[model samples]
Target: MELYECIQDIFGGLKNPSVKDLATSLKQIPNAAKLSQPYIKEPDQYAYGRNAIYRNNELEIIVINIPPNKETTVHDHGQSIGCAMVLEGKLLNSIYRSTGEHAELSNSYFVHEGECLISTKGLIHKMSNPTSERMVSLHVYSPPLEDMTVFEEQ
Candidate 1:
């Protein structure tokens, strides 16, 4: 099955506030790694996420392109839960927690190719390309994130 279809099925079954676990879902889509390059261009910008293949109340399937040594601004998924599998290069997945005034950096790590990360409620984060080459990742977000509450680092 196409990776998007598999994800659609998984999301279709889960109730709205429920989320698909990235670790378990990642195991079902080993071929998802083969779906890079075309979905992501060699970027002149920090990153890009588009080319949505599917969308529903439960989820959205899209791809992200991050260029070498670049990072995105800190942002939230707006109560949605997201699952992402890294396809190329190295990604620094930095997470933050929001308090009354600012968002504090909580966790940061290098996610290598073939790994996945889950973005859940109460989590604000950014993706960074910490390698010499471009990075591509496949993302599935539940409840469709139309807008996000972005944060500035303090």
Candidate 2:
């Protein structure tokens, strides 16, 4: 699929897009590692591939190379919409919701390569590489992903 066409399809209003359709569209784009070369400072630490990539109205693509047992803390996406597609390895995604003084785990999804996940504003979640091997994923956010607030467990 062409790039613009894919974006239109993804963002189009059509009763919500499925993970399958999103995955297929993302797979059509070249691997993110190839697109992220120019902006990458430390190729060894993390590699990000991005296209039509914009964060907070700026152009950017980020690839996070997650080693085993590593995880991102629970956080919210501010007001941006975001999606993630697994490029290599597996990831355990845990979704949560705030309840009074505590946070509740709402759902969990395990995604292997070729799987995609979409999140709208106010979505709270965290991801981890639960396997023994390294994991890689492509993240895309529209209208820019910025001003995120991390949650602390007290």
Candidate 3:
């Protein structure tokens, strides 16, 4: 399916969809799935991303670029489910679960090119590049996450 159409299907009113299912869906689309423009590198910060693709009330898509060894703050998705696909290079995602008064780190793993991972609501995590080169990823968020709650170790 075309990128636009695939995006449309994503928000086409599915109920309680799993992250794995969403990731598999995105896997079906070819490289041309990425939308045009707003492309940028994380030239200045720890990381930066561009919303180059689809957006609506139901969901939004982002194209993120991260330079080597730079990770994001541990964060929680407000009410959205996120599916991230690695376009190039490598990324290490540190996964966590909420407990006590803060989030706890559960595990960390690498996601390589053509691979995808899912982040569900209430789950906390941080992602970053771990290779000598930069990494690019396509992200799809359902229910349109407007903000995230940052977490700290207790």
Candidate 4:
């Protein structure tokens, strides 16, 4: 199926499908299918101080166009499921899960260009562009990234 057609079939409706359903739908499309690079020249400056491009009710895909010396805090998708496909540069994706009061890091690794990663509900993690080059990723979240919580460990 074509990309747009697949997107429409998966997301063109009033009642959004579940995360697992979206994942299954995505599997229909070629994993290597290239999406047109969206315009993301500047960072969406906000309290988090990171650029988040293209967030909507259908999906939340963002380009983390952060320069050197910046990092995202440890966070998790409380009840959302999503995936991240690295397009340019590198990122250290530290995946974790809640264990009592602290988050237990399960997999600490790097995801380079062409690599894809997926996560389910209650998946805690943190990502960073620890290189001198700009980092960009195509993120897709099902149910459209509604109210998400970013947690900080004290």
- TM-score of model 3 relative to the true fold? 0.80
Better of 2 and 3 by TM-score: 3
User: Order the candidates by TM-score, highest first — what do you get?
Assistant: 1, 3, 2, 4
lDDT of 1 by residue, 66-111 (tens): 7777787898988778878787777899999886567888999988
Estimate the lDDT of model 4: 0.61
Which ranges in model 1 have alpha carbons more than 4 Å from their true place? 1-22, 41-46
**Residue 51, candidate 3: alpha-carbon lDDT:** 51
Tens-digit lDDT track of model 4 for 29-123? 45423542444344545312233444457565444444554566677765667777666677788887666666666788988876766777777
Q: Relative to the unseen true structure, what is the C-alpha lDDT of residue 58 in candidate 3, on a scale of 0 to 100?
A: 61
| Cα lDDT of model 3 by residue, 1-154, tens digit | 5556656765455555678766876686666325422354455544555555677666677778877777778988898889988887789999887776687889999998889988977778899777888878888787778787888865
Q: Tens digit of lDDT per residue, candidate 2, span 1-154? A: 4433444444443233343444455666665445443332322432322233332242123455567887877877887556787777899999888765556788998988877777766888888888998777777654456687677643
- lDDT, each prediction: 0.73, 0.62, 0.74, 0.61
Question: Model 4 off-target regions past 4 Å?
Answer: 1-38, 46-58, 99-104
- Which candidate achieves the best TM-score against the true structure? 1
Q: What TM-score do all the candidates reach, one by one? A: 0.82, 0.68, 0.80, 0.67
Q: Is candidate 1 or candidate 4 better by lDDT?
A: 1
